């Protein structure tokens, strides 16, 4: 019935000291049945990161759509799209389907390659932007994520510390949601490098 609760899944992003983190679970189910434990929900175009929760088919279609648009953008502009710009592109792309919306909860993370400023943003299924400086959450366990993040979060955390924070927020939220979990991946992002880590978690 609710397109947003058929497949399950969560995404969360946090800003730190000259860095950003975006993480997601790996589950893909069909109601109570777990189907795949390798369904990643984070993608990247150049140095800009996008996480998407909701109906799996739309998660996939949106990734293909944004790969398509950022590719043309690069060819015409002769530079990679920035976080702020891409956020506007997501928003306008979603509002374009105002009355036949994609059932998703997009999340953007990245660092402006020119100002070095960390950036994150969230959206509802029709494009409304939520530009918080601390964290953005999305998915079937969003209430839980808000709870963890509000409690665990603190400003200017170092990459190594932010990693522990984002991970604990993801993990414990996922464990109180039946449709979330089954593996997780975390992305730590810095102006120069990006590290991807798979977390060990409950498999039930």
């Amino acid at each position: 019935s609710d397109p947003s609760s058929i497949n399950g899944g969560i995404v969360v992003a946090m800003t730190g000291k000259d860095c950003v983190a975006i993480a997601c679970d790996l589950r893909l189910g069909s109601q109570s049945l777990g189907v795949s434990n390798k369904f990643e929900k984070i993608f990247h175009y150049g140095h800009v990161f996008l996480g998407i929760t909701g109906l799996a088919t739309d998660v996939t279609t949106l990734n293909e759509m944004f790969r398509y648009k950022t590719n043309l953008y690069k060819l015409k502009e002769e530079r990679a799209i920035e976080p702020e710009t891409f956020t506007q592109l997501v928003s306008s792309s979603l509002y374009e389907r105002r009355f036949g919306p994609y059932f998703v909860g997009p999340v953007v993370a990245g660092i402006n390659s020119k100002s070095g400023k960390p950036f994150i943003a969230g959206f509802d299924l029709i494009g409304c932007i939520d530009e918080a400086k601390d964290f953005i959450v999305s998915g079937t366990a969003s209430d839980q994520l808000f709870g963890m993040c509000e409690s665990l979060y603190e400003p200017n955390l170092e990459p190594e510390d932010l990693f522990e924070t984002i991970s604990q927020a993801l993990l414990n939220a996922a464990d109180r949601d039946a449709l979330s979990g089954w593996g997780a991946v975390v992305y730590i992002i810095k102006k120069d490098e990006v590290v991807k880590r798979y977390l060990k978690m409950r498999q039930d």
Partner: protein
């Protein structure tokens, strides 16, 4: 009724020439001279306000137009064709860019859009090419300042400085002598005024000359305060008075 002219009015001749485009270029040649000079911290575009009668109010006719807050344009050739191109350019800057990315387009891309509009009047059915050449000056974060020329064929090229119209050959030569990559905006304005003087026959003052620049942001021309990241338009049209003050140091 119904436009039944669905075939091209511009076609290739045995020699390989596209007649209508050549003829449009000839119309551009008869037009009043206009020019543009790129400095290290700005760009200047200027032309002569060839009033068609002393009873006419030359200010109600702008040959230099703002396209976006950081991009301006000027031309040579058919004034009415220019006017509608400006309307279309301003609109496409929104429909093909601002309503998608939430920011104004970089100079080269808007120029690219204008160029596309002009190319289409070269092949689409039932129309003639635009009889104008444009000089578009602007600024954007990742490319800095730039100056472009767009011809009736839709072709466009970047310049350090150039002139179009009536005495473009002589003016281009005069610019090649005075241009260097260290010029400051005020210097370019000065060079612009000197170049334009050779092209003007009668009166030469702030009421017969139209000149604009793309320089620093003008917070006083924004209209509101309270948002740090919004500093104002870089495009600014000089006043008749500002032009005269500079003519005395000619």
């Amino acid at each position: 009724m119904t436009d039944r002219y669905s075939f091209s009015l511009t076609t290739f001749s045995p020699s390989g020439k596209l007649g209508q485009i050549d003829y449009a270029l000839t119309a551009v040649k008869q037009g009043v001279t206009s020019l543009g000079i790129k400095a290290t911290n700005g760009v200047v575009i200027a032309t002569e306000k060839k009033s068609s009668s002393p009873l006419a109010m030359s200010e109600t006719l702008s040959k230099v137009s703002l396209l976006t807050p950081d991009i301006g344009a000027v031309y040579s050739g058919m004034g009415p064709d220019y006017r509608v191109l400006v309307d279309k350019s301003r609109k496409v800057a929104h429909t093909s860019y601002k309503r998608i990315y939430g920011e104004y387009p970089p100079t080269k891309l808007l120029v690219s859009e204008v160029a596309k509009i002009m190319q289409e009047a070269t092949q689409s059915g039932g129309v003639r090419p635009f009889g104008v050449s444009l000089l578009i000056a602007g600024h954007d974060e990742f490319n800095g300042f730039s100056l472009y020329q767009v011809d009736p064929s839709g072709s466009y090229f970047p310049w350090k400085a150039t002139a179009i119209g009536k005495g473009s050959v002589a003016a281009k030569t005069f610019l090649e002598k005075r241009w260097n990559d260290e010029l400051e905006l005020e210097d370019a304005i000065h060079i612009a005024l000197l170049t334009l003087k050779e092209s003007v026959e009668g009166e030469f003052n702030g009421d017969t000359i139209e000149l604009a620049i793309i320089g620093d942001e003008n917070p006083d021309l924004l209209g509101y305060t309270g948002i740090p990241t919004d500093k104002g338009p870089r495009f600014r049209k000089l006043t008749s008075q500002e032009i005269n003050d500079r003519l005395e140091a000619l």
